[PDB]
Design a protein around this ligand. Structure first.
Ligand SMILES: Nc1ncnc2c1ncn2[C@@H]1O[C@H](COP(=O)(O)OP(=O)(O)O)[C@@H](O)[C@H]1O
Ligand code: VO4
Ligand SMILES: [Mg+2]
Lengths: 43, 784, 145
């Protein structure tokens, strides 16, 4: 359940869809960089 | 008192101070040449200090505010206006009072929308004097002051009151939008567009050519604009005062009837013109009698187009426009009815009668009978009595006037219906009266117009001088009283019990009374009144010493004009109209038939023109008395309607009688702005942030004011209020605006940095919770 | 003065978020948004004066080094617990510490900068005292830290 809270605020769409490429652009540049290898698996 | 050749001096030549140059000073003779071309010669020994005084440096190419003048006299004031007039600067301030000299020509850029925008964003005094600056100050007062505002525009016929009103309305319409939101669909459907379009309609129906003005206002107008708290116009109301209905049937030589008749005849298409049996204006008695004419149409054709457009904006249906056209055509044909005596009045030729009866929806034999005979019923059979030709002409003309006056009232109703809106916050009222007029021959119409001008001058004096100096006295200010010429006694002569109106009204109620019996009473009662003039030879006249000059009135016509009788026979006839528009106008109209007692000497009496007008003016002045006023003084530079022609004698007269000299004195020395100590302190607290303030409010006010003027001359503390000059208040309002705006920037920047920080911290949190959860979900999936 | 490695790293984080293009350049419009995201609340004026220095040519871009400089500059001022409090206090009248949402909305829309009503109504309806019936500024100032 502790995921749906952080995805309902992760889009400007306001229709339950977090435009793919934008999520990839969020990670690695973030507070806890994920070496893009973790990012290749969240696709 | 000796001045060398070429010296600039004021030469007092007993009447006024002349701007002059020393032409020569030799052999004990001094010659002065005035800037108006006059040459005055004197023995040098006879010249004393004023006779002659030195002229201040350049004075200076003019001064924007006459309170800045060094030399204060009529000569000085006029010269300032003259210098400015010569360079097309028609506006000059006297504090927040505005002087406007009619240019009688367009001045490039003066009233352009780019200029309106520039004035909307500045304070009074930051730009050259302009009517737009007054309209803006007035508008700003809706948030600076707690009351409604009004703009009162004074001046003789042709001075520029109507043009001034239109400019104020145009400016306020523009400023109203600002206050959001645009779209051309909005701006063409607009309440402000409708308010602006009321002018061409009202001018066509209520204005006419007179000797003093080709577009003379023949009615008084009070426009009230209702403004909401957000700053936009919600709607309005127009109140009309005493339309000159007699102009419909007769005009003095060289004048015209109402513009609308000429516009209708010049503007209608061939088909409608033929439908209403209309031809040229020369063919109509109601348009041809003055001999003017003197125009090859064209200006009237453009006015028709302008009216039609305005009526469309005003939501007059195409049928309503045709109905008004049909009524006006009916009036024109009605005027062409001629009578002959054949026991007694008889309609001579049937054509004009037939056309008028058709257009008015009346039966021609019924119309003929109503104009030529009077009806009486006796228990209970009808008795028809013939009228004589004078009575038939008076009936025809009373019918024409009734139709026009009712149509004008309906048009005003329609305008008011269109501009109707809420009254949620405050209002700005603008008064455009018919101006002072003194013709070769003056009748009752001029008496009423001049009375209204007199009543307005009394309001101007009450507010500028009387109440103002009374407030200074009550508040215990250090003040030297300024004298001023009060016209109160002239109004007393007109208005008091046994006064001019009282005697006119009393004689009107006596059927046996004539204009000659009235004049006897006027002379007997008022010969010794300082403001009344019993002519030494002119047996049909009486004079009134109006503020703007002595006017002689011919009594012939006063009783009949004041009575304003309309036969019940004619009202009954109109109610027979098959044309619904006409019936609707007369459906509930009150009877105005001639009364013949018996023993009905009872206190009421039927309302007369005078009594209804005195009431309306009193109602108006009472409304104005509760609003904060702005004054505009329109000055006619000449009597020839000419541009670039400043008649110094004509101008000086207006400056003198209107009290401009005394006005400059009180605005230079006085304190037009005042606020209770706490109110002043609470408003300007922002400006005291860097000051070491005392515990008492009087001291707090002093601390700020001392920074602006340590001499204590531009402000004073009264018993309860801080008094300050308009210039100082304007200086304080500009600085308050600057600090308030700077404070809004400080908070606008701090909240924007709160919102962005909140969402940046939220995104940084939402990701660290998904990154920790994915680091776990993928570590379990790696173990499988 | 000096910015600690932890500080520089914290700023490159916020920079890279707005640097979608991945070129190491954010737009002039974004400079405000980024600085604000990191604490610093520059005024529209302060922001323009910063741009006019960096971006004379009119390219509309800001590299990380020129941003860092803008940051360390605004960091020096310092003003102040009673400075925002003083700006809000001009919006009174009675010294009660109360400014109405009506004039506060007017400050946010008309004055300062013209901004989206849907974001400013949420900035009021959520960030307001008495739940509905007006806002306390000294509380809001304290909350704005
Ligand atoms: N501001 C002005 N600029 C140019 N011409 C003007 C101005 N004011 C008046 N006039 C001219 O003088 C005429 C008389 O002015 P108007 O306002 O109609 O007179 P009144 O004071 O009698 O209402 C105008 O209709 C116009 O031709
Ligand atoms: O010409 V006037 O509008 O002053 O009557
Ligand atoms: Mg007029």
């Amino acid at each position: 359940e502790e995921i749906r809270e952080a995805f309902r605020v992760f889009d400007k769409d306001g229709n339950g869809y977090i435009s793919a490429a934008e999520l990839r652009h969020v990670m690695t540049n973030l507070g806890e960089k994920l070496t893009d290898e973790e990012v290749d698996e969240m696709i | 008192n000796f001045f060398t050749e070429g010296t600039r001096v004021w030469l007092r030549e007993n009447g006024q101070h002349f701007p002059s140059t020393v032409n020569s000073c030799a052999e004990g003779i001094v010659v002065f040449r005035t800037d108006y071309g006059q040459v005055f010669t004197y023995k040098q020994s006879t010249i004393t200090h004023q006779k002659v005084t030195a002229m201040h440096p350049t004075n200076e190419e003019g001064v924007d505010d006459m309170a800045s003048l060094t030399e204060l006299h009529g000569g000085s004031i006029m010269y300032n206006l003259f210098q400015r007039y010569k360079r097309n600067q028609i506006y000059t301030y006297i504090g927040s009072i505005l002087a406007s000299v009619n240019p009688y020509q367009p001045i490039a850029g003066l009233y352009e929308p780019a200029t309106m925008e520039q004035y909307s964003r500045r304070h009074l005094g930051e730009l050259p004097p302009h009517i737009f600056a007054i309209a803006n100050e007035c508008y700003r007062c809706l948030w600076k002051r707690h009351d409604n505002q009004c703009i009162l525009i004074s001046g003789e016929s042709g001075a520029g009151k109507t043009e001034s009103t239109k400019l104020i309305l145009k400016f306020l319409s523009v400023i109203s939008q600002q206050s959001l939101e645009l779209s051309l669909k909005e701006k063409t459907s607009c309440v402000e567009r409708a308010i602006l379009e009321s002018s061409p309609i009202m001018e066509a129906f209520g204005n006419a050519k007179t000797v003093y003005n080709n577009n003379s206002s023949r009615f008084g107008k009070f426009v009230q604009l209702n403004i909401c708290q957000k700053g936009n116009i919600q709607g309005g109301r127009i109140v009309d005062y005493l339309l000159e209905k007699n102009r419909v049937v007769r005009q003095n030589p060289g004048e015209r009837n109402y513009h609308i008749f000429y516009a209708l005849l010049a503007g209608l298409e061939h088909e409608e013109r033929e439908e209403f049996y209309l031809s040229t204006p020369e063919n109509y008695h109601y348009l041809n009698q003055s001999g003017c004419v003197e125009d090859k149409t064209i200006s009237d054709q453009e006015s028709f187009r302008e009216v039609i457009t305005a009526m469309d904006v005003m939501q007059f249906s195409k049928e309503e426009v045709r109905e008004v056209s049909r009524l006006l055509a009916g009036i024109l044909h009605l005027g062409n009815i001629e009578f002959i005596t054949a026991g007694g009045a008889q309609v001579s030729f049937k054509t004009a009668l037939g056309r008028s009866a058709e257009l008015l929806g009346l039966d021609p034999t019924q119309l003929t009978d109503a104009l030529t005979q009077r009806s009486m019923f006796l228990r209970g059979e009808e008795i028809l009595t013939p009228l004589n030709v004078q009575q038939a002409v008076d009936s025809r003309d009373s019918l024409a006037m009734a139709l026009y006056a009712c149509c004008f009232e309906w048009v005003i109703k329609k305008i008011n219906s269109r501009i109707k809106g809420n009254e949620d916050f405050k209002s700005i009222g603008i008064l455009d009266i018919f101006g002072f007029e003194n013709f070769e021959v003056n009748h009752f119409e001029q008496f009423n117009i001049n009375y209204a001008n007199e009543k307005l001058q009394e309001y101007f004096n009450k507010h500028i001088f009387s109440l103002e100096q009374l407030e200074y006295s009550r508040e215990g200010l250090v003040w030297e009283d300024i004298d001023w010429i009060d016209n109160g006694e002239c109004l007393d002569l007109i208005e008091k019990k046994l006064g001019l109106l009282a005697l006119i009204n009393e004689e009107s109620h006596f059927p046996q009374a004539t204009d000659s019996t009235l004049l006897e009473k006027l002379h007997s009662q008022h010969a010794n009144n300082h403001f009344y003039v019993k002519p030494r030879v002119a047996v049909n006249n009486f004079g009134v010493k109006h503020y703007a000059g002595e006017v002689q009135y011919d009594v012939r016509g006063i009783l009949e004009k004041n009575r304003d009788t309309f036969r019940d026979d004619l009202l009954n006839l109109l109610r027979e109209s098959r044309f619904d528009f006409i019936y609707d106008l007369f459906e509930h109209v009150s009877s105005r038939n001639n009364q013949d007692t018996l023993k009905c000497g009872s206190k009421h009496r039927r309302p007369t023109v005078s009594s209804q007008f005195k009431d309306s003016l009193h109602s108006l002045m009472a409304t104005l008395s509760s609003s904060n006023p702005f004054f505009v003084r329109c000055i006619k530079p000449n009597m020839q309607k000419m541009p670039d022609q400043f008649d110094q004698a004509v101008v000086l007269n207006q400056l003198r009688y209107s009290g401009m000299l005394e006005t400059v004195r009180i605005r230079k020395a006085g304190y037009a702005v005042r606020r209770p100590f706490q109110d002043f302190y609470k408003r300007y607290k922002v400006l005291m942030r860097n000051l070491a303030l005392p515990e008492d409010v009087r001291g707090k006010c002093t601390s700020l004011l001392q920074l602006y003027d340590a001499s204590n001359s531009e402000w004073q503390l009264g018993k309860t209020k801080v008094f300050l000059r308009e210039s100082l208040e304007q200086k304080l309002e500009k600085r308050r605006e600057e600090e308030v705006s700077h404070a809004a920037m400080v908070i606008r920047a701090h909240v924007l940095g709160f919102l962005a920080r909140k969402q940046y911290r939220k995104v940084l949190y939402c990701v660290v919770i998904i990154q920790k959860n994915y680091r776990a979900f993928l570590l379990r999936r790696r173990f499988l | 003065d000096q910015l600690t490695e932890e500080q520089i790293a914290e700023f490159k984080e916020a920079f890279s978020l707005f640097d979608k293009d991945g070129d190491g350049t954010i737009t002039t419009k974004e400079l405000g948004t980024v600085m604000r995201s990191l604490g610093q609340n520059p005024t529209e004026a302060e922001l323009q004066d910063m741009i006019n220095e960096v971006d004379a040519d009119g390219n509309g871009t800001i590299d990380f080094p020129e941003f860092l400089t803008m940051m360390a500059r605004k960091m020096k001022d310092t003003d102040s617990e009673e400075e925002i409090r003083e700006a809000f206090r001009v919006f009174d009248k009675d010294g009660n510490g109360y400014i109405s949402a009506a004039e506060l909305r007017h400050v946010m829309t008309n004055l300062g900068e013209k901004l989206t009503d849907e974001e400013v109504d949420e900035m009021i309806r959520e960030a307001d005292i008495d739940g509905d019936g007006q806002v306390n500024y000294e509380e809001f100032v304290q909350m704005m830290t």
